[PDB]
């Protein structure tokens, strides 16, 4: 923008805070006709036109939107539309308004369905509209008094979709963007792996829950314990019986018959008797460990060691190429954050009417 | 197959669901003499001949077989042959029937023991027959009323052997197959490592269980606690005494004699007195940590970093080469999933008789 | 220094312990005019001039400073200035005295602000002065009786800043220094990743704490449980309800209607009824696992696999280049550890006065 | 040896079990003058001369020694020399007897101190004599009735030194040996890292234990809890207060003053009041996470990614070179396992006498 490009970044965040800090001699400009000749009003105004600053105002506004909404859903969730619930309603509206606005700006006569296909082809835009569709469903779900609790679950999912959106910060980074490109490549196969590990672990869970107990009258309470325990032992922790794996251990390795001195029990508790001795416990628990913490781990890191080396170099220039359109966007974007962008959306509608 | 090869894959799964979705204009064909001139009966029929579809019907049938059997073993396990127990009996039979069928199809006069050696040489076929042998043993084990509980343990193991078989899905993948090839290389040495880590951790477990308690009358209850705790601390979590490691701590680092101001105890609780003070606890617990979460981890990732770079390139063309025979198989495979494949097995036997 | 360079290192640490061990024939010298002709007084004196030894005396003194201060803060923390509190006060003073001393030694007429900029440009010096500023604030915070407890928190933070400083040991290592250089490169982006994972997990925490309970009257007790549970499940362990995830499970996968034999419940506990059945529990708990233990892990190891290969080679010579100034420093540094360096600081002030 | 080299390995282990399995046609030979012309006595005898078999007999005997000793120390530990205690005494004696025996076999007139230096230079021999010195100390420690409990701790350490010795198995492996070479390179720096992570985590432990409680009267009970909790949270699990981190949470993020609707508390519980509110808990717990599960992990994997690529290639031929002397050893080694090697040690002493 207007200001000098060698001032670092922390000085932007600090001068953003204290208005007169711009008036002081703690920020740099170029073209000393304005740096030395101090008109604070124009200097602050020009400061506000730098896309770097407008970018940071957006990121701060987004931060506020996210954590405020979180608070409202956290404690202030109430059947009657609270003031804050309407606040985020209009706040989100103003945000999607700007998003949709950038679809019709085309100064040339671009095809309408063409630019739609491009938006619909972008992974990031795809996730954004996913949240929009999910929210607008959750809104009426909350509005219906018979589905308030579902209303909570959908709005909670919406929150998550918004908070994972912050990976966008580093797309303009000096040193992180390229790595975002890489994980964009990985997204495809880490999804598919996710599947197989899911069915993997639940097959182990139900195996445990089947053998170490008789039939349970309800699966309802089973999964309350079993899936919670699954959550915990996703990383090999608790088999599934916190109260102890074997309700009745028995028998021990071939020993105790030592003519010199017994060491431990030794009897067929196993085939001749109900398979519920410590021996079965050893077999089952070691089986889980035989595969869980090893097979899937070496597999993944092999996948990544492979794929990484396939994209390591050209990923650089691709990021550099991508840099353009983002810069063009915020260069031309109106200088107002979403809370105060409404008056600029009114100006746009004024142009839309005339 | 007959249909166009550029329709993606989600459209196959969606058109699979809704019969008239084929009749609608939401799926592509080639040779517009059939795409434009709509005979729905032939269009759906031709759709059903595509090996891509027959593949998906198999994968859905297999999914159902696995989860239904799981349910039956989960809760409906009962001494008297339940209806569902017989259902999976015949369902599995129909599945191994098709498998054995593909051993005798050879249109040329191939040696009988030759094609047997090839089947027996295939790791995947090896695992399949492992499950077959284990199941058929478990069947009679359940049938004997004196070994019902063992019957549960064997059938549970059978289930696991079937569920790990699903890695076969991605052998036809665009981007995962090659990595399956790699782990097929790794299978050899990750097994051998598995051994040494097993004896490693149990040596630590028995060490703990030996020193921090007097002789236990039964190893039976020991392993009920010790091996469960081992399961948990497979990843360095609980030493083995959830009730606290030291039943009686004592003594502290050389301190407390500070002429200025004491800081902590300081006495030989150690050599002169029974080695059961906090000092021994510090020594033992840190010893576990000295090696467990470090030695074996850096070892493995070194192994993989090494071996990966030995197979990284030619693995590609090997997968491409392997692609053929699978495609040939499902091209020629009769178009019926296992539940409904029985009538086609009857047609084959009709040819076998005449 | 004076002594032979091929004696290894353990012999330095052992001869350091036992004064007459120098007098014995268990250490090497060069220039056998002193090795064979034994003047123990000069031999031990010359031994004390070797920067290798002076280095080790510093590292032992630093070790003592750190663990003694820890003890004093551990148990002997008391409102009235204890003897030991004053001991570390003067001990730290003597240490920063030597540090500041090395800023004015310049034998040439170097610019004063220049050498200040160089000190201020050094990451390691930056962390050192961070601790100095934090300590001197904590000192008066403790001194104020109304903020004793804050006094504890600041002094505890100070301790941590000192103990992480010990990575400096290996900067002179044969084989570790170069790797310190690498992580100095990594410091930048592992910080930024730290941010996104922080906001990531807390978004999941508040999501859990929002849906599986009604509004809590106080966030105070929430975070006492929720952030402790967050600490635990930073690595996917406990969702947030150790007392069980679902306070009331209900409904089960589409089953139980099996005309042959029921397997589990099956009812809309979900949309038609308050979204608090086991089905919601399965959805939420698996969602956490869908992303937490996978997305961020493969991301990081991709980042490191990338950046490592960008610095792997020239890092070597850079370390070799850096080696000089450290050697020059301890060569010229006065031969006294901080406890006994005071008399040498007096000699320096004597030169400063005259 | 005598038998054919293409028989695999499982057939060795199976024919080892069943004596007549050698007499059957399920094992291969070369020089069919003996394969076809069956003299079972000579065939089994020749089988017993193959170093491959003698190797396996040693590995089985060693396995038995280790697990039997474990049992004896596990439960049968008793002040009076038990029969089994004397059994392992003589068993170990017979083992070190063979080891020392291989020091004097030199058919040439090799220097006595030379071959001693070579033995003392070998890492593996170094660990072996470490166990010997530790055992022989533990023996008399047990023998003294006043130090029985220390006797337990030393013998338990001895056990560990023996069980980690089994990594020797894979030194003759086809595919693992080379990787053992690599970790032999790593041993140096993983030790040094071990140090810094140790002092790292305990600095965090004492920090926690200092701030979240007043002075404890005894460090004795502190470490019983704190070091056990440290053991658990070595991988970021439990801070140190399983009973809850904050004994009294208070204050909440700047909120609750929302003119629309309160969300949470908001007061200076922090500086103006004793620093023991939830805010301090958030600060401390996140601080632990800021560094523990990230800094040290990316550091290590960087170290290994670096060093691995420095040794990846020549490690191969080094293993191949090393292969010789092991083969020569067991070729010439007398054909008897330690239990039955005694009679062959007698024959050697017979030669030693005459």
PDB file of C-alpha atoms in Angstrom, chain B residues 68 71-72 74-78 82-84 87 232 237 252-255 258 260-264 305 309, chain C residues 68 71-72 74-78 82-84 87 232 237 252-255 258 260-264 305 309:
ATOM      1  CA  UNK B  68     -24.728 -58.498  10.586  1.00  0.00           C
ATOM      2  CA  UNK B  71     -24.607 -58.182  15.650  1.00  0.00           C
ATOM      3  CA  UNK B  72     -25.458 -61.868  15.834  1.00  0.00           C
ATOM      4  CA  UNK B  74     -22.782 -59.468  19.820  1.00  0.00           C
ATOM      5  CA  UNK B  75     -26.105 -60.131  21.514  1.00  0.00           C
ATOM      6  CA  UNK B  76     -27.938 -62.974  19.762  1.00  0.00           C
ATOM      7  CA  UNK B  77     -25.327 -65.602  20.583  1.00  0.00           C
ATOM      8  CA  UNK B  78     -27.348 -68.512  21.942  1.00  0.00           C
ATOM      9  CA  UNK B  82     -30.547 -69.202  15.872  1.00  0.00           C
ATOM     10  CA  UNK B  83     -32.047 -68.260  12.533  1.00  0.00           C
ATOM     11  CA  UNK B  84     -29.351 -65.626  12.061  1.00  0.00           C
ATOM     12  CA  UNK B  87     -28.053 -67.181   7.870  1.00  0.00           C
ATOM     13  CA  UNK B 232      -2.701 -48.975  29.479  1.00  0.00           C
ATOM     14  CA  UNK B 237       0.853 -44.238  31.343  1.00  0.00           C
ATOM     15  CA  UNK B 252      14.554 -37.203  50.086  1.00  0.00           C
ATOM     16  CA  UNK B 253      17.379 -35.739  48.004  1.00  0.00           C
ATOM     17  CA  UNK B 254      20.363 -34.605  50.070  1.00  0.00           C
ATOM     18  CA  UNK B 255      18.675 -31.684  51.821  1.00  0.00           C
ATOM     19  CA  UNK B 258      20.517 -26.531  55.200  1.00  0.00           C
ATOM     20  CA  UNK B 260      19.749 -21.660  56.682  1.00  0.00           C
ATOM     21  CA  UNK B 261      16.433 -23.474  56.276  1.00  0.00           C
ATOM     22  CA  UNK B 262      15.515 -27.125  55.748  1.00  0.00           C
ATOM     23  CA  UNK B 263      13.942 -28.061  52.415  1.00  0.00           C
ATOM     24  CA  UNK B 264      13.263 -31.798  52.612  1.00  0.00           C
ATOM     25  CA  UNK B 305      12.901 -43.915   6.663  1.00  0.00           C
ATOM     26  CA  UNK B 309      13.551 -44.984   0.121  1.00  0.00           C
TER      27      UNK B 309
ATOM     28  CA  UNK C  68      18.912 -24.672  44.796  1.00  0.00           C
ATOM     29  CA  UNK C  71      14.276 -25.934  46.428  1.00  0.00           C
ATOM     30  CA  UNK C  72      13.957 -22.494  47.979  1.00  0.00           C
ATOM     31  CA  UNK C  74       9.597 -25.248  46.492  1.00  0.00           C
ATOM     32  CA  UNK C  75       9.235 -25.356  50.260  1.00  0.00           C
ATOM     33  CA  UNK C  76      11.173 -22.492  51.858  1.00  0.00           C
ATOM     34  CA  UNK C  77       9.081 -19.755  50.266  1.00  0.00           C
ATOM     35  CA  UNK C  78       8.237 -17.446  53.157  1.00  0.00           C
ATOM     36  CA  UNK C  82      14.925 -16.024  54.053  1.00  0.00           C
ATOM     37  CA  UNK C  83      18.675 -16.495  54.055  1.00  0.00           C
ATOM     38  CA  UNK C  84      18.414 -18.618  50.916  1.00  0.00           C
ATOM     39  CA  UNK C  87      21.548 -16.133  48.534  1.00  0.00           C
ATOM     40  CA  UNK C 232      -5.579 -34.711  29.556  1.00  0.00           C
ATOM     41  CA  UNK C 237      -8.033 -39.218  26.061  1.00  0.00           C
ATOM     42  CA  UNK C 252     -29.515 -47.884  18.859  1.00  0.00           C
ATOM     43  CA  UNK C 253     -28.505 -48.544  15.254  1.00  0.00           C
ATOM     44  CA  UNK C 254     -31.392 -49.657  13.042  1.00  0.00           C
ATOM     45  CA  UNK C 255     -31.968 -53.055  14.650  1.00  0.00           C
ATOM     46  CA  UNK C 258     -35.098 -58.476  13.181  1.00  0.00           C
ATOM     47  CA  UNK C 260     -35.530 -63.600  13.478  1.00  0.00           C
ATOM     48  CA  UNK C 261     -34.121 -62.185  16.713  1.00  0.00           C
ATOM     49  CA  UNK C 262     -33.759 -58.651  18.066  1.00  0.00           C
ATOM     50  CA  UNK C 263     -30.228 -57.305  18.496  1.00  0.00           C
ATOM     51  CA  UNK C 264     -30.632 -53.795  19.902  1.00  0.00           C
ATOM     52  CA  UNK C 305       9.961 -33.241   6.189  1.00  0.00           C
ATOM     53  CA  UNK C 309      15.556 -30.863   3.470  1.00  0.00           C
TER      54      UNK C 309
END
